[PDB]
Amino acid sequence: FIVEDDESLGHKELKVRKGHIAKLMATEYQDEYTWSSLLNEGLVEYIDAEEEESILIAMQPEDLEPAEADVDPAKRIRVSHHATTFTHCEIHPSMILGVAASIIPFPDHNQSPRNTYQSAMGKQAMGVFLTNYNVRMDTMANILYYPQKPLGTTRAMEYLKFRELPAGQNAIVAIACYSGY
Amino acid sequence: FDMGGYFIINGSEKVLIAQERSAGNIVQVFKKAAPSPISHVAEIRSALE
Amino acid sequence: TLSHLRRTNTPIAKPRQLHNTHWGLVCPAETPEGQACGLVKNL
């Protein structure tokens, strides 16, 4: 997202406003305002790693924009919007993740490698790989009998079609010491 | 659901794996290790587009 | 299937490590364990 000092009314604020969001969601209900629409309007830009060196990014827009002029204990410890230099803002931080990690529920609550492991196992999980399975002659294929969408999901899964083509079942699980088996 | 991006070659679905490389036509200065006559080098991996 | 169509190979100073520059471009967790660890990136 592009952030501009360019706002007569106050501070340095993100080019994209609540009006563009409704303009996009008008098209989302139609299934005339694309991604290209934001790109050509100049609200969003493409930044490679070399360009990234000369910019300054906000993680959240709202949380990292208007400064101070009680706080919940259960939430994580966050920093601030100290800078008035912000050239850009992060669409969503969860986008640093790739296909596999994006199925991990609460990955910000796991030890670093435990996540590296799930982004290896999900590739060996059974489910519905494609709906045409019955019509294709592939050497080896596994289809889960009664697949289930996960109860706990990532906002990212929406675009990954995971709830449409799952890899597992929601098992009723006890974490217990039972027969020692 | 099938996204494409792959090829069908003699029946099989083949994926072309992205192959990482260092960028061309780029000026890079590297300190050359203690047992060497040359102390520093400036390299350019020049090739035509 | 999706993650196989987003795969990267790095053939041959410290490549395997997760670099600062990989932020937003490459997955910090999707990497094999073993000889390929950190050399096979995922977008």
Binding site: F1, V16, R17, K18, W35, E62, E65, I91 | - | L5, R6
Partner: peptide
């Protein structure tokens, strides 16, 4: 107020539009 600041949930409506247009193998195809 068609030019009001954006919220946290709003970024998803943009991400929706990105994949709506680009898909997931955007790179391979293009």
């Amino acid at each position: 107020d068609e030019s009001a600041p954006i919220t946290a949930e709003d970024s998803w409506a943009v991400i929706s539009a990105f994949f709506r247009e680009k898909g997931l193998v955007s790179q391979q195809l293009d």
